[PDB]
A = this chain, B = another copy of it.
């Protein structure tokens, strides 16, 4: 199907603006939740999940709640990441961070609530059977937990200001960043009920796509410095570009192995967006 990226982003944004109902207890909790939820980003995680379903010949709206959940999980990690005991960021995308507007305690709890809400949302989605709902929930909890997204944050924070090797660096990005990405495509594969071998290719695809993400960003930070512990600091500039290209190629490779009844133009298009620059 023809789905312009900006038209999906728009739909996601409309759903996210109205995804939490106003306070019954008269606190700022839900305006804090909504504040970060509406911060406005690129929304690649939800969009990835949506586009993956479309490539798999499945009604993309089946995955809207899962996509919303996914963005809630990403939002919550940011609110916690930004806190003074952690990254300590006062600004993100030109706006004040949650804790700068609401205090540390509101932000902690706004994070906790969003984590919780993500699970409520999937478990309540009537477009999916209970069997598929369990699969998505199981996958989200593993992707987000101690051996996924939060485990990577632990590893990242432990590594702060240390010269770690490349297996460590990759371990951090694979769990901290890649597990949500892999959730996006595999939750879709699960809603679509595609066959084991298509699942395998979508898996590798998602892994390589995920590794592209942070490499590109390290390169852009370096390209930026050229004009008037990371991938380029370990590998140098050309090593990083080589790494990027290798993941690009393995991603693109993996798509060409998906059986021909599925049209991957969308997935392939996301690879190129991650690759560009």
Contacts and interface: CB of A to CB of B under 8 A. Distances in A.
A6 to B, nearest CB: 31
How many copies of the polypeptide does the oligomer hold? 2
B115 A146 contact: no
Interface in A30-50: 30, 33
Contacts of A113: 145-146, 150-151
Nearest to A113: B146
Interface stretch (A7-15, A135-143, A182-190): A135-143
Interface in A128-163: 129-131, 133-134, 137-138, 140-142, 144-147, 150-155, 157-158
A171 interface: yes
Given A115-B115, A116-B115, A119-B141, A106 B154 contact: yes
A29 interface: yes
Given A151-B25, A154-B27, A116 B104 contact: no
A116 B131 CA distance: 20
A27 B147 CA distance: 11
A151 B154 CA distance: 27
Nearest to A76: B112
A104 B85 contact: yes
A125 to B, nearest CB: 10
B150 A116 contact: yes
A201 interface: no
B142 A29 contact: no
A233 interface: no
Q: How large is the interface on A (under 10, 10 to 19, 20 to 34, 35 or more residues)?
A: 35 or more
Contact residues of A: prevailing secondary structure: helix
A109 interface: yes
Contact of A105 (B28, B115, B120, B157): B157
A23 interface: yes
Given A105-B157, A134-B130, A145-B116, A151 B86 contact: no
Contacts of A119: 119, 137, 140-141
A271 interface: no
B105 A85 contact: yes
Given A25-B147, A29-B146, 15 more contacts: A25-B151, A25-B152, A25-B175, A27-B155, A27-B158, A29-B150, A30-B146, A33-B146, A83-B108, A85-B105, A112-B115, A113-B150, A116-B146, A120-B142, A123-B138
Top 7 nearest A-B pairs by Cβ distance?
Answer: A85-B104, A120-B141, A116-B145, A130-B130, A27-B154, A123-B138, A113-B146
10 contacts: A20-B146, A25-B152, A25-B155, A29-B146, A105-B157, A106-B154, A116-B144, A116-B150, A119-B137, A130-B131
